[PDB]
Amino acid sequence: TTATMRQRWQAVMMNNYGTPPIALASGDGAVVTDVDGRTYIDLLGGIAVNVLGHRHPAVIEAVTRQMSTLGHTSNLYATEPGIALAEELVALLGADQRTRVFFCNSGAEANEAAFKLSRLTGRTKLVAAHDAFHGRTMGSLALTGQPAKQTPFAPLPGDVTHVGYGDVDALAAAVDDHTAAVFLEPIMGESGVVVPPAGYLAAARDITARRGALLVLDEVQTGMGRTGAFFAHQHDGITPDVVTLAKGLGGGLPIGACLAVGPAAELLTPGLHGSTFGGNPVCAAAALAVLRVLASDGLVRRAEVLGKSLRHGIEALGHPLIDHVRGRGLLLGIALTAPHAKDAEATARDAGYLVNAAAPDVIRLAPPLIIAEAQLDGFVAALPAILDRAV
Amino acid sequence: TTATMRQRWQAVMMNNYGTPPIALASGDGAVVTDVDGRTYIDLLGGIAVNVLGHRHPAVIEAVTRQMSTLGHTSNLYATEPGIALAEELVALLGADQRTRVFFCNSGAEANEAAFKLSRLTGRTKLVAAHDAFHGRTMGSLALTGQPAKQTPFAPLPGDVTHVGYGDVDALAAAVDDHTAAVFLEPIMGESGVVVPPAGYLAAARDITARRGALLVLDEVQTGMGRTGAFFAHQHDGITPDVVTLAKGLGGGLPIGACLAVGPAAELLTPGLHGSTFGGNPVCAAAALAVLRVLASDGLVRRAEVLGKSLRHGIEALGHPLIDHVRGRGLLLGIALTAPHAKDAEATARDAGYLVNAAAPDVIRLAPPLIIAEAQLDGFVAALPAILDRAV
């Protein structure tokens, strides 16, 4: 039962998440089942992680095959899956200069690697955006622009200046010849699927390039083809100096990556960084499978098509509680006219849909890329009642 | 070929590890095979991670079963394997007070969690040991006692004082009523399997208790029964406030944990920490299988027995290059009378054995706990020629 599982949680887990309201038992595709037998359509994908849903045969085959071949070895040894995965990610980035890859286990670790890269420029000033989320480790938490999550842990590593997201003049004013790097999400996910103004990422690329600063794009949430290009920044035709990936990279298995382009790719020399589990064969094999399915099933182009019809469908409702829909592909935010997103999260759950109240007035969707249009259509048809009940 | 694999590595990988000298293709138990078909006895376990070796049936079964049931969900949802793993780990720690668990993906992340815990004491001063290794992210790197690895990324999070490992009075002088926490490895692994004097951890527990500081024990490398007790600190009859685990926790799959005891277990409140992949069902299922096998096959006791026999056999060789053997159970250092450990690593490789030059004069062993006594016997008999060729 759900009550017993929550009691077991509260007896042993640290309370850094609160107590989960539901206990999940099984999942298949975009449908999960709780321990009481209720089914839910998963419009959140474990916070954009389950790009291929649950029990995808290609991921299961890749992981089972690799476990029965060769597991963890450490980076004292070269192994094929990590090398092939690095090759595939470099090809997908499509940069004009040599690109090199560092693997790790999480988005926070990927941004820690980028943070350390920034130190090797000889500069210590960093710029990020108010409300950005880059991770919860000491370095990535300094880049995160969420004071409630930072203040109890001060002092954090320096020297970070936060500016308004999407404000070109504010960014130009903050970046100078002492700036090691600028960190930006192409769409701010955790804060409410905040999409920047047209031209902003191109401006950021120009500002940083003129000032000798690295441009680091955090694609941990916007990557893996979710927005209809493999990297969301590719919609703007720019090439950053550093890109970080995690979440959906492994289809559920823990893996992150830091990609560095041109001179930034040579900053890390032997002995200056590492991670025991980074690039291990099983997790890399999972990520290779995800890339293969994305390509074979055309799921990147599909995410744009599904995301456009979903966005159109929500706006066509004309519900008075919805101010606007924003985002791109299958990263979508329903911005509300009143702070009822947490209530709508609960009433969606009553209706069999898993969504996220990313802000008091924003409902975030990040469904599996294998989700059926029919399942999305069903959510849109259910949404007027969900929102009515929310108030 | 090995040359082709190394050439591919050098074309795509960041150079933070250098280029691995061999490329591994498969593994089974304590034997790994490179891309040219050569087999090696794995006396390092991918740096103490492969506790049950490669292709352990129990781990394969747990992972394949869980992948076909429910994958990643995030901590927005309660799931059985993580709760069960937290229960099992709290049982193995056996603390008198309530113990709570936080899951993450790595040793660095587990010590980052402990670092953030220490902030919630209201103090910002921290103490660690010269040459200690606690990870390579910005917070854990501040704790790591290696100035050569810290200097290029300064400034690091503060305020950390380092003292000589095993020195009771240096520790007592450094710990005061402003000290948030003391971080110690029960045996310093990465620096050369450095064992502290008798009573030292007990003194650290008394010093921290009298000054109101947390004692944090990093069991990332010394845990998982490797030393003949599940946690190495249990040989000393102390209970720390915080314990961190990773490496072998998942038998190969990436998972780490921070355990906190008593008042320290209540410091983290909702929203103050998290990790997207932490506690995910597949890695937790793997870790549960490792715990089951350690218990059912009596591998903790076996580690002590085999470790004693191994140490005795190396010291019986009477080889002039061997000063002494130190460590406990199956974490061993061969301390040499001259700095030939790096050369001995290569000549051991020629003889078909994977070992680690942890220091210029220390060969580190951390074999799978399922290693065959005959595989160890063969290593001991081969060691004289390995060392002779090294010189």
Give me the catalytic one of A103, A115, A133, A231. Answer: A133
Q: How many CB atoms lie within 10 A of CB A369?
A: 26
| The token pair that represents A297 in the structure block | 């099933």
Q: Which fold has domain B60-296?
A: Aspartate Aminotransferase; domain 2 (3.40.640)
Query: Per the omega criterion (within 30 degrees of 0), is the bond before A57 cis?
Result: no
Cα B44 from Cα A60, distance rounded (Å): 29
SS3 A56: coil
Domain locations along chain A: 2-55+298-390, 61-296
Helices (H) and strands (E) in chain B, counts: 13, 16
| CA pseudo-torsion sign B101, B105, B109, B110 | positive
CA of B361 vs chain A CAs: smallest distance (Å): 18
Q: Counting beta carbons within 10 angstroms of the beta carbon of residue B389, is it exposed (0 to 12), middle (13 to 18) or buried (19 or more)?
A: middle
Q: Do B71 and A55 touch (CB under 8 A)?
A: yes
C-alpha A6 chain-centroid distance: 27
How was this model experimentally determined? X-ray
Cα B326 from Cα A142, distance rounded (Å): 40
Distances (CA, A) of A224 to A205, A246, A368, B17, B44: 21, 9, 11, 27, 35
Across the A:B interface, residue pairs with CB atoms under 8 Å apart total 328
- Partners of residue A156 in chain B, C-beta under 8 Å: 157
| CA pseudo-torsion sign A33, A36, A38, A42 | negative
Distances (CA, A) of A314 to A47, A301, A391: 21, 20, 18
SS3 B251: strand
Cα B101 from Cα B82, distance rounded (Å): 10
Which of A83, A157, A269 is nearest residue B12 as measured by Cβ atoms? A83
Measured N-to-C along each axis, helices A80-93 and B2-12 cross at an angle, to the nearest 10 degrees, of 40
Question: Which pairing describes strands A353-354 and B99-104: parallel, antiparallel, or unpaired?
Answer: unpaired
Distances (CA, A) of A182 to A114, A174, A389: 10, 10, 42
Cα B190 from Cα B321, distance rounded (Å): 21
Q: Do B14 and A102 touch (CB under 8 A)?
A: yes
Q: Counting beta carbons within 10 angstroms of the beta carbon of residue B64, is it exposed (0 to 12), middle (13 to 18) or buried (19 or more)?
A: middle
- Partners of residue A17 in chain B, C-beta under 8 Å: 75-76, 270, 274
Cα B391 from Cα B380, distance rounded (Å): 18
Cα A128 from Cα B315, distance rounded (Å): 57
Q: Position B353: which residue type? A: Y
| The token pair that represents B239 in the structure block | 């209970």
Query: Per the omega criterion (within 30 degrees of 0), is the bond before B368 cis?
Result: no
DSSP state of A107: H
Cα A204 from Cα A320, distance rounded (Å): 36
Cα B221 from Cα B358, distance rounded (Å): 13
Question: Which pairing describes strands B125-129 and B160-163: parallel, antiparallel, or unpaired?
Answer: parallel
Cα A341 from Cα A192, distance rounded (Å): 11
> CB-based contacts of B66: which residues, under 8 Å, 6+ apart?
B81, B281, B282, B285
CA of B17 vs chain A CAs: smallest distance (Å): 5
Cα B330 from Cα B354, distance rounded (Å): 15
Question: Which pairing describes strands A179-184 and A256-261: parallel, antiparallel, or unpaired?
Answer: unpaired
Q: Which fold has domain A61-296?
A: Aspartate Aminotransferase; domain 2 (3.40.640)
**Nearest residue to B184 via CA among B211, B218, B158, B209:** B218
Q: What is the dihedral of CA A284, A248, A28, B276, to 10 degrees?
A: 100
**Nearest residue to B123 via CA among B175, B200, B201, B186:** B175
Measured N-to-C along each axis, helices A373-390 and A341-350 cross at an angle, to the nearest 10 degrees, of 120
Contacts 24+ apart (CB under 8 A), A308-312: A309/A373, A309/A376, A310/A365, A310/A376, A310/A380
- Partners of residue A348 in chain B, C-beta under 8 Å: none
The architecture (CATH level 2) of A2-55+298-390 comes to Alpha-Beta Complex (3.90)
For B218, list phi and psi in degrees, rounded to 5.
-90, 100
Please give the order of strands across the beta sheet that includes B31-34. Answer: A78-79, B23-28, B31-34, B39-42, B353-354
C-alpha A165 chain-centroid distance: 17
DSSP assignment of A228-292? SSSSGGGGGT---SEEEE-GGGGBTB--EEEEEEGGGGGS--TTS---TTTT-HHHHHHHHHHHH
For A168, list phi and psi in degrees, rounded to 5.
-70, -45
- Partners of residue B282 in chain A, C-beta under 8 Å: 252-253
DSSP state of B213: P
DSSP assignment of B278-309? TT-HHHHHHHHHHHHHHHHTTHHHHHHHHHHH
Strand partners, A328: A331
State the Cα angle at B99 between B96 and B103, rounded to 5°.
150
Q: Tell me if B132 sits within 8 A of B144, measured CB to CB.
A: yes
Cα B341 from Cα A73, distance rounded (Å): 21
For B18, list phi and psi in degrees, rounded to 5.
70, -165
For A100, list phi and psi in degrees, rounded to 5.
-120, 155
What's the distance, Cα to Cα, between the start and end of chain A in Å? 29
Q: What is the dihedral of CA A246, A247, A252, A255, to 10 degrees?
A: 20
Cα B10 from Cα B113, distance rounded (Å): 34
Which of A72, A83, A137 is nearest residue B49 as measured by Cβ atoms? A72
Question: Which pairing describes strands A331-336 and A322-328: parallel, antiparallel, or unpaired?
Answer: antiparallel
**Nearest residue to A45 via CA among A257, A224, A218, A297:** A224
Q: Counting beta carbons within 10 angstroms of the beta carbon of residue A297, is it exposed (0 to 12), middle (13 to 18) or buried (19 or more)?
A: middle
SS3 A391: coil
| The token pair that represents B311 in the structure block | 């140490």
Contacts 24+ apart (CB under 8 A), B304-308: B304/B227, B304/B228, B304/B328, B304/B329, B306/B330, B306/B371, B306/B373, B306/B376, B307/B227, B307/B228, B307/B331, B307/B332
B279 is in an annotated binding site: no
Query: Per the omega criterion (within 30 degrees of 0), is the bond before A388 cis?
Result: no
> CB-based contacts of A296: which residues, under 8 Å, 6+ apart?
none
Question: For residue B176, how many C-alpha atoms fall within 13 Å in the half-sphere facing its CB?
Answer: 8
Q: Tell me if A280 sits within 8 A of A83, measured CB to CB.
A: no
Top residue of B2, B4, B13, B98 to mutate, by most chain A CBs within 10 Å, is B13
Q: Do A254 and B252 touch (CB under 8 A)?
A: no
A247 is an active site residue? yes
Q: Do A13 and B102 touch (CB under 8 A)?
A: yes
Q: Do A12 and B75 touch (CB under 8 A)?
A: no
- Using only C-alpha atoms, chain A has a radius of gyration, in whole angstroms, of 21
| The token pair that represents B162 in the structure block | 């380092």
Q: What is the dihedral of CA A13, A19, A25, A28, to 10 degrees?
A: -110
Distances (CA, A) of A106 to A4, A255, B109, B379: 30, 6, 9, 37
**Nearest residue to A86 via CA among A103, A69, A74:** A103
Q: Counting beta carbons within 10 angstroms of the beta carbon of residue A202, is it exposed (0 to 12), middle (13 to 18) or buried (19 or more)?
A: middle
Residue-wise over A247-269: b if at least 16 C-beta within 10 A, else e? Answer: bbbbbbbbbbbbbbbeebbebbe
Query: Per the omega criterion (within 30 degrees of 0), is the bond before A377 cis?
Result: no
- Partners of residue A49 in chain B, C-beta under 8 Å: 72, 74, 276-277
Q: Counting beta carbons within 10 angstroms of the beta carbon of residue B361, is it exposed (0 to 12), middle (13 to 18) or buried (19 or more)?
A: buried
C-alpha B131 chain-centroid distance: 15
- Using only C-alpha atoms, chain B has a radius of gyration, in whole angstroms, of 21
B116 is an active site residue? no
For A173, list phi and psi in degrees, rounded to 5.
-70, -35
C-alpha B334 chain-centroid distance: 18
**Nearest residue to B213 via CA among B337, B325, B123:** B123
Strand partners, A32: A27, A40
SS3 A157: coil
| The token pair that represents B21 in the structure block | 């000298």
Cα A27 from Cα B73, distance rounded (Å): 9
Distances (CA, A) of B341 to A43, B96, B192, B335: 55, 43, 11, 9
| The token pair that represents B19 in the structure block | 């280029």
For B71, list phi and psi in degrees, rounded to 5.
-95, -155
Q: Which residue of B has its CA nearest to A115?
A: B138
Q: Do A12 and B275 touch (CB under 8 A)?
A: no
Annotated binding site of A: 107-108, 133, 136, 218-221, 275-276
Q: Is there a common fold for A2-55+298-390 and A61-296?
A: no
Give me the catalytic one of B103, B125, B236, B247. Answer: B247
DSSP state of B20: -
Distances (CA, A) of B64 to A298, B57, B61, B294: 27, 10, 5, 20
A131 is an active site residue? no
